[PDB]
């Protein structure tokens, strides 16, 4: 029974503890390098476990998450990039191994993990409740003015 100016749907698969992590202004590598919500967030976050589409025999290492970022992540930012994180002072950028680490690591999932390590599927609905022409409603009646 509300009217919203514009609705944004953001979708990604994240682990069970990360559901507790994902919330307006929290701590953790996912919350600060992978996805950050605004402090005054107005919306809903939807989480349900998906162990039938993100799991298969011999595992599935298709998904990804970032742990190495130069700074914190501004809210709603697509910082998609493959740049080696610098450690110490070496300009590396040429070879893996010591003090040259990849910004993201495989998000491998198998059908046999713990509940905190299960493939949860998360989508977040963001709404804009402001005095502006809306686009989305629900039930309606149009009684004459």
């Amino acid at each position: 029974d509300l009217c919203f100016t514009n609705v944004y749907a953001d979708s990604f698969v994240i682990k069970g503890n990360e559901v507790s992590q994902i919330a307006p202004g929290q701590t953790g590598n996912i919350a600060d390098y992978n996805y950050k919500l605004p402090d005054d967030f107005t919306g809903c976050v939807i989480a349900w476990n998906s162990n039938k589409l993100d799991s298969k025999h011999s595992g599935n290492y298709d998904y990804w998450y970032r742990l190495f970022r130069k700074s914190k992540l501004k809210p709603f930012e697509r910082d998609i990039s493959t740049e080696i994180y610098q450690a110490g002072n070496k300009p590396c950028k040429g070879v893996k191994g010591p003090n040259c680490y990849f910004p993201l690591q495989s998000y491998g999932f198998r059908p046999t993990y713990g509940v905190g390590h299960q493939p949860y599927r998360v989508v977040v609905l963001s709404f804009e409740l402001l005095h502006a022409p809306a686009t989305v409603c629900g039930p309606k009646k149009s009684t004459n003015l």
């Binding site: 307006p24 929290q26 701590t27 402090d39």
Partner: protein, 48 residues
């Protein structure tokens, strides 16, 4: 006076906890400090 919050130092609260959780504590500090200032102002008005 902590006014019912974690600590009486706003800068300590800021540097120790995240924004959306220290928000309640700093709001408590605001409600305490502003109300105290209100009492001071009213008493000053009576004395004036």
């Amino acid at each position: 006076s902590k006014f019912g919050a974690i600590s009486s130092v706003l800068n300590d609260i800021l540097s120790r906890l995240d924004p959306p959780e220290a928000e309640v504590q700093i709001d408590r500090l605001i409600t305490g400090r502003l109300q105290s200032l209100q009492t001071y102002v009213t008493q000053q008005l009576i004395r004036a």
